Amino acid sequence: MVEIIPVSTTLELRAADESHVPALHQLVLKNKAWLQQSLDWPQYVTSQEETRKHVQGNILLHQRGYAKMYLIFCQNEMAGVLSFNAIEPINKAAYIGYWLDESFQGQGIMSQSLQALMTHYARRGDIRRFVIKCRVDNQASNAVARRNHFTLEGCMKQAEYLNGDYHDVNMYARIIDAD
Amino acid sequence: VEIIPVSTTLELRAADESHVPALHQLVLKNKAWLQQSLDWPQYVTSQEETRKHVQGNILLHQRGYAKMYLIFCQNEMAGVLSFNAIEPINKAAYIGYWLDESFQGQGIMSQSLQALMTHYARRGDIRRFVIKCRVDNQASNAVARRNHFTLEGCMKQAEYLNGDYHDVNMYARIIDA
Ligand SMILES: CC(C)(COP(=O)(O)OP(=O)(O)OC[C@H]1O[C@@H](n2cnc3c(N)ncnc32)[C@H](O)[C@@H]1OP(=O)(O)O)[C@@H](O)C(=O)NCCC(=O)NCCS
Numbered sequence A: 001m002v003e004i005i006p007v008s009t010t011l012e013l014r015a016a017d018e019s020h021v022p023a024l025h026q027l028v029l030k031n032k033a034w035l036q037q038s039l040d041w042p043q044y045v046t047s048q049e050e051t052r053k054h055v056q057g058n059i060l061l062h063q064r065g066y067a068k069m070y071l072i073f074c075q076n077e078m079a080g081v082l083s084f085n086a087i088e089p090i091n092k093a094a095y096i097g098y099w100l101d102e103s104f105q106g107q108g109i110m111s112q113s114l115q116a117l118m119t120h121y122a123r124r125g126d127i128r129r130f131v132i133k134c135r136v137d138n139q140a141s142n143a144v145a146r147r148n149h150f151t152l153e154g155c156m157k158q159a160e161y162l163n164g165d166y167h168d169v170n171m172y173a174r175i176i177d178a179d
Numbered sequence B: 001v002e003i004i005p006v007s008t009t010l011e012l013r014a015a016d017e018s019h020v021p022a023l024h025q026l027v028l029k030n031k032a033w034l035q036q037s038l039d040w041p042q043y044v045t046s047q048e049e050t051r052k053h054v055q056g057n058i059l060l061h062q063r064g065y066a067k068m069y070l071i072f073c074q075n076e077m078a079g080v081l082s083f084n085a086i087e088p089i090n091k092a093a094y095i096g097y098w099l100d101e102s103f104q105g106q107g108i109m110s111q112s113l114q115a116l117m118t119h120y121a122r123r124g125d126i127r128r129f130v131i132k133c134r135v136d137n138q139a140s141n142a143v144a145r146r147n148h149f150t151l152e153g154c155m156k157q158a159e160y161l162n163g164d165y166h167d168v169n170m171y172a173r174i175i176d177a
């Protein structure tokens, strides 16, 4: 049941579906070592079948409006993932998560995809409050937030376990009302 | 059966199927009151629907993904203290609570909260306790300050309630045993 959110001449967001699993799994394996530097989970990655269960879970949430999982394709090549880890329908708030294949960084691809996604959901009107939580020492992530006009709202002490230590987490938000 | 002691007159009991009739009654009795601060009370309907929700929370509770405890005062069900959600890897949980309106003003929530947090910190599986609460919910913000939570931030228009969006304070306390 295909769903695309245009981003640019070379970029688009496609709702995750079963056919994306093999390529997404490979993409995770390919970037596993570098992602483990910023994220805890790449570690537990094992088989394509387990990755499938996870996507399958997100697809149900995506369909019920309780989360979203989009894959970023650059020139028809899978380049990364942009998601709402959770949506709070009544508060019209959503928490954002993302990562890019390492050789796709530095081209404003995440910023553009993010800008397109947020715009899409604010115009639909079902999400107006967008949140990014990211480790205080995640430089690239904090830069995405700033560049995309999120307001720092606070800092959560030792909120995130990563590589043997609990790290502080900046909390950013941006409110968009398509009046 | 799980009980966390609090005082000679107070204890916390993990919610179970047997509590459903009385919990459903307490919720009906306090609906109007709770709607002043909470959005969920007005979707309340039948005892069956309540049993549905408790069965699901009991599974989360057993799996360690949330906890639902009932506060008993001299053997009378007086409110709920729960971890709305736990992030096992981060050893962090989000706190939710409410008291029947007539049990306010006796430190019942503070005492229960204190025992609960100390219990989990001794277990070692939760070290970070979080309280999200509306900037204008005086009673809740008092619970967080009274119990030594530190204000970490203020979330703009994070909660929709009674026709308005409200800024929400985020408090946290880290306890290592
Ligand atoms: C976080 C992450 C997605 C950011 O990647 P990114 O490529 O830096 O992000 P953007 O797409 O916004 O690109 C910004 C960069 O591209 C440049 N750029 C080029 N064209 C651009 C455009 N059209 N618009 C905006 N920036 C543009 C900017 O100058 C900037 O360059 P610089 O960082 O070299 O100064 C990436 O580092 C990654 O996947 N990290 C690992 C996983 C992780 O940390 N995820 C987040 C956990 S909270």
Ligand SMILES: CC(C)(COP(=O)(O)OP(=O)(O)OC[C@H]1O[C@@H](n2cnc3c(N)ncnc32)[C@H](O)[C@@H]1OP(=O)(O)O)[C@@H](O)C(=O)NCCC(=O)NCCS
Residues within 6 Å of the ligand: B034, B037, B038, B096, B097, B098, B099, B100, B103, B104, B105, B106, B107, B108, B109, B110, B111, B132, B133, B134, B137, B139, B140, B142, B143, B146
């Ligand atoms: C939030 C709520 C649980 C707070 O109730 P509470 O009774 O005020 O909480 P506490 O247990 O901390 O009791 C503190 C009060 O009892 C008093 N008290 C008496 N003995 C006490 C004791 N031994 N220890 C601590 N406080 C004591 C305090 O002085 C204080 O009185 P005050 O309100 O006049 O200042 C209650 O108002 C409620 O259920 N609200 C509606 C639902 C809601 O807001 N939930 C939270 C959503 S974030």
